Symmetry: C2
Subunit: 365 residues, 2 copies
């Protein structure tokens, strides 16, 4: 077997053996070594995610090379990906909580979303080509994490949930809500079955490096063929999660980001569709429009699952957990549950991104 777990010394040796000072800065080792990053999966989760991540980064790079790190080398057996150093940037979630507003974040992520999502779909690819990519990017273990954490466990009294006792009354309201859970189920069924395009699968503010002028999407290890709306919904939900961690007028930049990411996505996806669709149906008046309306509806539903899941599930976000004082934290966490719920149940009622934003604003006053 070719697999050996790396150390600072074997990492530098490998960088040299490929012709391209070391500190481990990381389930994953990250070796920072001009500069370079050598990422390695450690063996509970398969090391195959490293193959997915590298391949997904490379596919993303054909369309948006400026929005993802460049990959210099990958090895499936060693579960290694050698890539661009982005140390000089900050994780978007961390920056946002510190009060950075990143003026271009939404334009950049909108463009990422519109191009990555269009160009790996049946709209852009011969069906026989896409069917082979579905096989290639099948990702059963990482999908399992999402299927459980985003779509199932928050909605029942399951072991993996993690929430304050003061939140219990509002958590049990959700658990006892048949109609929202039926909707969560439909959304999970779409996640399980709708192999529409190659998605990132975990596009939150913690999977983005940012400065004032730059944006880079990282860690596409959850990538697989899933619904187009999913990456869009998770990103939007994480902007709303940051809004909830802020007060008053300080929220406005995040609402502007929600608006702008949808707008840029819709326009980027639309330009790509007009220019590069292989589909004889693509040019029929109203088909692109109805396609977008369905992406929009799903995205809002997936945003609501992400709002709820991050509040009471196993994997929390720092936006909510670091809110002080404690009583303010409980209140804002109740609102994340309630807005997430409204998003899920009302997803088909919204006509524009502005309606989504205005409903959110109303609820969180």
């Amino acid at each position: 077997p070719l697999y050996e777990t790396l150390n600072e010394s074997s990492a530098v040796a490998l960088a040299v053996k490929l012709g391209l000072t070391c500190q481990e800065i990381g389930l994953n080792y990250v070796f920072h070594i001009r500069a370079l990053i050598i990422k390695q999966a450690v063996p509970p989760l398969t090391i195959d995610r490293a193959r997915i991540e590298s391949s997904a980064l490379i596919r993303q790079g054909e369309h948006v090379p400026h929005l993802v790190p460049r990959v210099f080398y990958s090895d499936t057996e060693m579960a290694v990906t050698v890539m661009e150093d982005l140390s000089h940037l900050k994780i978007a979630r961390k920056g946002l909580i510190e009060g950075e507003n990143y003026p271009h974040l939404s334009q950049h992520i909108g463009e990422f979303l519109g191009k990555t999502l269009f160009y790996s779909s049946d709209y852009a690819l011969e069906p026989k080509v896409k069917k082979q990519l579905v096989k290639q990017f099948t990702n059963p273990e990482l999908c399992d994490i999402t299927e459980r954490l985003v779509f199932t466990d928050p909605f029942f009294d399951h072991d993996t949930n993690d929430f304050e006792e003061e939140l219990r009354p509002f958590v049990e309201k959700l658990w006892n809500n048949d109609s929202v859970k039926i909707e969560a189920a439909k959304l999970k069924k779409s996640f399980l079955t709708s192999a529409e395009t190659l998605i990132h699968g975990d596009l939150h503010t913690g999977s983005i490096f940012a400065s004032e002028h730059e944006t880079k999407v990282i860690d596409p290890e959850f990538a697989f063929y899933g619904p187009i709306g999913f990456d869009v919904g998770q990103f939007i939900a994480n902007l709303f999660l940051n809004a909830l961690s802020r007060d008053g007028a300080d929220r406005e930049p995040l609402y502007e980001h929600v608006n702008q990411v949808w707008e840029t996505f819709e326009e980027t996806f639309s330009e790509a569709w007009q220019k590069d669709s292989l589909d004889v149906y693509a040019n029929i008046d109203g088909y692109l429009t109805d396609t977008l309306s369905h992406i929009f509806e799903e995205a809002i539903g997936f945003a609501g699952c992400e709002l709820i899941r991050r509040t009471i599930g196993l994997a929390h976000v720092a936006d909510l957990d670091t809110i002080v004082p404690f009583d303010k934290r409980i209140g804002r966490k109740r609102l994340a549950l309630e807005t997430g719920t409204a998003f899920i149940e009302k997803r088909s009622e919204f006509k524009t991104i502005t309606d989504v934003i205005e409903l959110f604003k109303l609820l969180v006053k």
Copy 2:
């Protein structure tokens, strides 16, 4: 390479007397009949040398038949042996039965056809879905049953070509005015496109993929579903819609009160499907959501809507596309044939456009009846 094309002698050596009896031209079917006992056997083999198609479909077909046999062994031929590289499937002889399409055109009513097909549909469709399987297991089955070439046939012929002026279409000049009407109908074509997009993307369960009346052997008391070579992970409503559409295609070839058994079959197949799917759901779902009141109901409404849309595609596709059905082509006289073919286009279009408005299977039957008066 192990592949060698069989002949009558080769086939007996592998497995008395042997006759090649293949219906199409893409497959050999060797019937082997013995006289120690009056026992018999079928050796099917894919021929490479027609739509150009690889011989891999033989692997899909045998695998699909074996999977179906786990849940409905009484509704599919038994498989005794299969070989991927030889593209061979050795299976149960069903020569004593009649192709259902042929029998229906002859005026056979097959009282149990819909009961049996409904059960086939409910069990095959449920037990290969995420409702019944661990998602990690189902995901490996999606890979195993990936069927790009046969899917491409359907994507073109069912979902695309009839709706534009494409070279695969085949229709009488008398039909042209009504055909051009369809091509110019933006709103129905947008709906066909959505249905196609579900076909391309909704990997919900292992489907048969070509479940028409020509893919069924029948007698008064027996029904067997054959030729699952188009099988892949696709939308649950697809097999349901194709079958139903082919019942309606037969009703169109009939006159007056003779149509009633076919209408009863449409009613019964939906009802048995829904019942069967529902019983399987109750007893064998792995999903924590499965018993929340209204979830099975909404899931069925979606299956139903898609089924009716796919039925409409099939109604249109069989009328003006590359692959016709004997129900309509053998209608006499010629003027009556043109009239009934116009109606298949019209009912197919209505099904597609109105699919979300129907509440029950009887709504669909009653609309069809009105349109075909």
